[PDB]
Design a protein around this ligand. Structure first.
Ligand code: NA
Ligand code: NA
Ligand code: NA
Ligand code: NA
Lengths: 221, 221, 221, 221
């Protein structure tokens, strides 16, 4: 009704890393699609632009935009974005699907991506859960704080979500099942529901944060 | 429209600490009121149940419930809540307006409050910004993680918001003005907009977190 | 022989909080006494200046100085120290035996104590291990970092030791017995042996640190 | 005299990474040499076994043992140590001169090295200070905590020193000069003086710690 205080009806996101039909970016895509958002799409390698033309058959997306971007590979990211900017224009944010195998990538696209957000934006970046650590969020956390500062001046917010264990995508996570305060795991939707928060206008004065969508398990520590 | 994935239309919150017309709990009340939520109200001392019967004249709240609760004072909290439970019934969450001057209070009401959330809930707890620290979030952060564990079993989520400097409620915060990545301060609304996230269903698998609604300043560190 | 790179032969310390014959400050006193250090002595309350005139019978301390100081009570600390400065003169450091039940105390004496260290010094401050936390070191850690800065300019080093469970001074610490990497507890001597490090010249460029003398248990986390 | 509570007279250390005449390992070697310790020596590459046969001319080391070990290269580390164990026998500790360019190395030698410490030991590991971070101690800190646990059972202590900026080995560290609480930098000696602490018996119940020999600068944060 008047929960237009999200904005997000009509704004355009770039969703990256949306590998098969259980990829989290796929939950994020749907919660988003469902909320009104035009969306754009990056496929990282080959093929799967199929699972996709397919995939998008569940979403009501009246134009259908896909871009092979190998995040691994920089101009692959630069001509992705000027391509997109050519093709559809300005974005309000990009979800991104995250040594820096994956740190740099974020950094790169951050920077590429802002050229499309001239009035400003929101960039979400997710990690998932290998031993450890973390470190590994410490590092992550930090690489988002740095970006926060940078594009803060340009009114682009930058935040991370850290994604707990999700079944449908070591069966000793029966462990979290059983120690995470809510005694269950997360899935994609509940990940991409926080993504909606984060790209949306409600998270208005929030940037450089790491929101753990993980049933409460970080608290175990 | 279909951003009924917040729930929050019709659910009932207890909003505490909603001192004058610039209190943050007052932003939270309005974002909430605006979203469909019945609300209940705690006044901590005297009088102000006026600013209130008044205050609520801006909100479309067709019943009008207020309860003097001195959070400082425990049975004041116990007969607040069984009172409320008597008077209106079950809650879906309470916003709360936070040595433990204010730590204990949270703890207490957490525990009082759950007796009203039989199918479960969401409790938000805010701090604002004295020198320091923090410590002082470290401690805060922790006292929310502990509660997270406790009421996690009962499906009540528990999270904190840490609230940056807000003008309209040392003029050296001109400092944040000028170093916080977004180069501005926060107000109530943008605080209570995150509160909405947090009590709402989008923050579904999120508990024991501290979301800094502070233009990005935590990142300065 | 030439492990005069400790200094500490002849320098004068004030040892506080040296309650009975199993007090840690008592280990620190002995390791110290054994190393050559003149020592001075604070008793916090009454009596025990006995256990002491006694206690010191095990130490080869040819003068015998004791000062009732209630750390709790400030002028009790101010006329302690100008007293001492009167009575014996300049110190090279003070061991101290640590809301701020015990934080403030440190702070106070820090400040009192420096008037005696005109060429500079070393102040050690110990905590021991109630639930928790910590917080509680976070806070501690911090209150030592602040002092570090302050008296750094005046060449007084300031560090903390955090003291694990020690038997001879919940029998579920059989827990540490059994999970602390070295599979044993600490005692006083091994606490005051680090104290020697810390007041001595080897910890020369070390200040604002917290050295856990606790068989390795902090690492469990 | 009776500051034989260090042990360290006669015990044998392996000192690695002792590149030229200003290398820190070189301060550690001397403080050590000066304290009575037989020492053994690893050179990582080529040549420099010269600076060394040379270098050692300042130390009173009546036997002269050197081993080319490329830490980078594992069997280079395995036949280093069984070599040594062959050649001289059991060690009491090794100083070591530290993606894991340098993390793994530590890990490796930890494990190699213990076969020589049958009654147990002490391993020190240093980092020096590139932007950052840290992370980078977070990670370091952690990789020492893990080892702490492992060889704790076998009574080998494991700790790190983190080494501030040292002139004689960006001239914007004039910055620390001027903000580090003691208003000066550290050198090698004051690094290797803490190393002595750490390998010595005074740091008896201390393991998995990170002792910043850096004039107090960590406290700036
Ligand atoms: Na639980
Ligand atoms: Na900025
Ligand atoms: Na163990
Ligand atoms: Na200073």
């Amino acid at each position: 009704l008047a929960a237009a205080m999200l904005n997000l009806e009509n704004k355009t996101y770039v969703i990256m890393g949306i590998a098969n039909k259980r990829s989290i970016a796929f939950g994020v895509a749907k919660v988003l699609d469902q909320l009104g958002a035009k969306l754009v799409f990056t496929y990282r390698k080959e093929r799967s632009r199929k699972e996709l033309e397919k995939l998008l058959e569940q979403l009501n997306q009246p134009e259908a935009h896909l871009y092979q971007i190998d995040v691994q590979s920089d101009e692959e990211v630069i001509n992705g974005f000027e391509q997109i900017g050519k093709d559809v224009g300005n974005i309000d944010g990009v979800y991104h699907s995250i040594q820096d195998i994956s740190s740099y990538s974020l950094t790169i696209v951050a920077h590429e991506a802002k050229k499309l957000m001239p009035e400003g934006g929101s960039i979400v970046a997710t990690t998932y859960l290998y031993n450890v650590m973390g470190v590994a969020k410490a590092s992550l956390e930090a690489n988002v704080k740095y970006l926060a500062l940078d594009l803060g001046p340009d009114n682009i917010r930058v935040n991370a979500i850290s994604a707990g264990p999700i079944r449908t995508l070591n069966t000793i996570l029966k462990e979290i099942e059983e120690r995470a305060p809510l005694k269950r795991n997360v899935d994609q939707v509940e990940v991409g529901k926080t993504a909606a928060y984060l790209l949306s206008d409600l998270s208005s004065g929030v940037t450089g944060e790491n929101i753990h969508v993980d049933s409460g398990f970080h608290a175990i520590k």
